[PDB]
From a paper:
Transthyretin (TTR)3 is a 55-kDa protein that aggregates into amyloid fibrils under pathological conditions. In its native tetrameric conformation, TTR transports retinol-binding protein and thyroxine (T4) in the blood and cerebrospinal fluid. Amyloid aggregation of TTR occurs by dissociation of tetrameric TTR into monomers; these partially unfold into amyloidogenic intermediates and self-associate into soluble oligomers and amyloid aggregates. Here we identify two segments of TTR that drive protein aggregation by self-association and formation of steric zipper spines of amyloid fibrils.
To pinpoint which of the eight segments drives aggregation within full-length TTR, we created individual proline substitutions within each segment. We chose the substitution to proline because it is known to inhibit fibril formation. None of the proline variants fully halted TTR aggregation, but substitutions S85P, E92P, and V94P and the S85P/E92P double substitution significantly decreased protein aggregation and altered aggregate morphology. Kelly and co-workers have also analyzed TTR by NMR studies and x-ray crystallography in neutral and acidic environments to assess structural changes. These studies have confirmed that the EF-loop undergoes large conformational changes when the pH is changed from neutral to an acidic environment. We speculate that the S85P substitution, near strand F, constrains this flexibility to prevent aggregation. As additional evidence, we tested fibrillization of the segments 91AEVVFT96 and 119TAVVTN124 in isolation as well as their mutated versions to find that the substitution of residue 85, 92, 94, 119, or 121 did hinder self-association and fibril formation.
Residue numbers in the entry:
A (entry chain A), D (entry chain A): 10 to 125
B (entry chain B), C (entry chain B): 10 to 124
The structure:
């Protein structure tokens, strides 16, 4: 599991469940190519997006579909989605956790990068 | 002037208006002594808490009354208040902006310190 | 005026100065068209990106060039940039402040929307 | 495990390790009485602070010793500590996770309250 996504809801104080997440990898022509996707679980987590073999160095984008999440709760949101863009680097063994904390008009995102 | 408080509401995307703020300063006996208080304006800001003369070196606590703010909006919040504790003016006078971004079950606080 | 960007540095407790910001607007063909750009001032603010006349309804993307900011300060950052995507002016004209609070491996963004 | 504390470092993108955490419970005389304490682990977590039996309804304070953490890293910080104050409420079964994300001049705290 080299890449995991965790989403929290700051209004309810809970995991953000059933949030759609789309991952893209930047192609040689500078376009975003679909890479992996899923929906967060009851724990607000999305595991098994990729493998160590496929997750090579590159520029990746994680799109978290926040607007659909808030609309389902009946809360008017600001953003279309949250976008997290970063370079994956082979500086020794690494695991990446992309965390996001959501509010209707604000979000925060943190990366937790560890040596397993 | 040397100490300002700014509060935003992350649910509405607006300044957090009429939020009560209490400032304390740690005394020689280690107790929290009342220092200043007020309420945020329509812009979510609270100015005029103190003066350069009165705002001496010390340990200060800025208590932002978040629970009362959320309850008045009909939203159940988690925290009793947000507490911001810091040493001020230990390298000479500075201007401090204590900013807070509020959600019902989360908040962030940042300090902007200028010379 | 109707669109302002404000950026703070959570490591230094200061405005984030000289941060490049690029704004795009989604076109009818679903592509991101350049809309405006600039750099934050000594106050961490970027004013004058657009006018009420030009800032019509649409989907906008505000790209804040965080990696270049951190690299210039000698700090290794995680993100390439912070991207803020939103629909603007769909219920008539509004004034938008896009605020961002930066750390090397984390950022937050908030919108303050006024009528 | 009704109460857990998790601390992250936003400068390094890592768990905040060996951070001292002190929990207090508000007494009848309005004073803060020591309740539990510990240091965050290699995962930035602090488990086993209390038990379901002892963790009754009340007002609690979680103090995270951020200044000592940053001083050890040689980074000048703003806050003396981060303080998280809340009422524990018996609205059915509950687990509380107090999360904190630390930067030298800013921190964020979130509560994740779940029904186990
Ligand atoms: Cl003042
Ligand atoms: Cl503008
Ligand atoms: Na994975
Ligand atoms: Na516990």
């Amino acid at each position: 599991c080299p890449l995991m996504v965790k989403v929290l809801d700051a209004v309810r104080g809970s995991p953000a469940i059933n949030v759609a997440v789309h991952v893209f990898r930047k192609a040689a022509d500078d376009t975003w190519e679909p890479f992996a996707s899923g929906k967060t679980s009851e724990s607000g987590e999305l595991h098994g997006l990729t493998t160590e073999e496929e997750f090579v160095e590159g520029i990746y984008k994680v799109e978290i579909d926040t607007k659909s999440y808030w609309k389902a709760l009946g809360i008017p949101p600001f953003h279309e989605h949250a976008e997290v863009v970063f370079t994956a680097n082979d500086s020794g063994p690494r695991r990446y956790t992309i965390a996001a904390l959501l509010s209707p008009y604000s979000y925060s995102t943190t990366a937790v990068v560890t040596n397993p």
